[PDB]
Amino acid sequence: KWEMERTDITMKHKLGGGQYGEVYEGVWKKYSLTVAVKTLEVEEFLKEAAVMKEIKHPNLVQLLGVCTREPPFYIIIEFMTYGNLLDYLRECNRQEVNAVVLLYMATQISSAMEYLEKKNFIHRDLAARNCLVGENHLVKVADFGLSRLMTGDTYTAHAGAKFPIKWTAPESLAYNKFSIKSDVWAFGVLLWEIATYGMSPYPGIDLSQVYELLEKDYRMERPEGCPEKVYELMRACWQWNPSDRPSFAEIHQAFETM
Numbered sequence: 001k002w003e004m005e006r007t008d009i010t011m012k013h014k015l016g017g018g019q020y021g022e023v024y025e026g027v028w029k030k031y032s033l034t035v036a037v038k039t040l041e042v043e044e045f046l047k048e049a050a051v052m053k054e055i056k057h058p059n060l061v062q063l064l065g066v067c068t069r070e071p072p073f074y075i076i077i078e079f080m081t082y083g084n085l086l087d088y089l090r091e092c093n094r095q096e097v098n099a100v101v102l103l104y105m106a107t108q109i110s111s112a113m114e115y116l117e118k119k120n121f122i123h124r125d126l127a128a129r130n131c132l133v134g135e136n137h138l139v140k141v142a143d144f145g146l147s148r149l150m151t152g153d154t155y156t157a158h159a160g161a162k163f164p165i166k167w168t169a170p171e172s173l174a175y176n177k178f179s180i181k182s183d184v185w186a187f188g189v190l191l192w193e194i195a196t197y198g199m200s201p202y203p204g205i206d207l208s209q210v211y212e213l214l215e216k217d218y219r220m221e222r223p224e225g226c227p228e229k230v231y232e233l234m235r236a237c238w239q240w241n242p243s244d245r246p247s248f249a250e251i252h253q254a255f256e257t258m
């Protein structure tokens with residue numbers, strides 16, 4: 001019942017200024033409803049759809065349908081008007097997108113991640129560039145496969161593997177060890193991204209030197225205007241030992257009872 005017919009969608013523009021891969025603005029003509037359309041090798045492409053069929057949460061991206069074993073193949077997703085969170089923060093009116101709205105943003109992502117934690121999913125690339133902003137500041141967690149779509153300024157090699165270095169937990173850099181706790185660390189950086197209205201992490205520091213810095217216990221400074229308690233949440237997310245890091249259940253609770 002997920003199967004749609006290609007011709008029921010009118011295809012329009014490339015999303016994200018054309019830096020988010022083969023994903024388009026489209027319209028489900030029957031409902032006059034704007035949708036996002038991922039277009040197409042096929043076995044990875046089909047496995048994405050399968051995963052997304054088992055994802056239902058208000059702060060996670062929502063499959064609407066697929067067009068299958070015929071090219072072009074589509075994955076059709078509910079449309080998020082305002083696009084990615086990174087660019088959103090960077091270009092927003094900060095009286096409208098004020099500290100309350102920043103908090104509401106973080107609280108939404110932690111709910112999404114609480115849900116992924118319960119489902120034993122590991123995201124592996126959490127960051128503001130992978131979050132979507134819709135009407136009334138609704139935020140949804142997504143995965144655009146950006147490691148194949150971006151450059152060495154964001155994704156590059158550490159010890160012979162490719163990483164989004166400045167979002168990557170130390171044990172993942174050192175052992176290719178990925179877990180829900182490596183996603184917590186990433187969440188830490190994403191909280192810093194939100195609080196800075198989309199500043200790049202470790203400003204001015206080359207991706208080359210990040211691991212050694214962390215290892216000597218350096219972490220990023222408290223952003224301007226960020227409450228001490230939210231900063232300590234970042235610092236909790238960035239414990240060297242993944243065991244010492246809070247669960248997403250724990251983080252969500254902290255926002256709830258602030």
Ligand SMILES: CNC(=O)c1cc(Oc2ccc(NC(=O)Nc3cc(C(C)(C)C)nn3-c3ccc4ncccc4c3)c(F)c2)ccn1
Nearest residue numbers: 015036038048051055061077078079080081083142143145
């Ligand atoms: C203006 N509006 C817009 O720009 C706009 C654009 C928009 O486009 C898309 C957004 C999200 C996706 N897809 C995903 O998010 N995939 C995903 C989620 C997860 C989770 C659920 C596990 C996080 N795992 N994987 C996921 C799973 C397997 C994968 N295998 C290979 C590659 C990637 C993969 C990703 C997409 F295809 C298109 C939607 C709404 N608005």
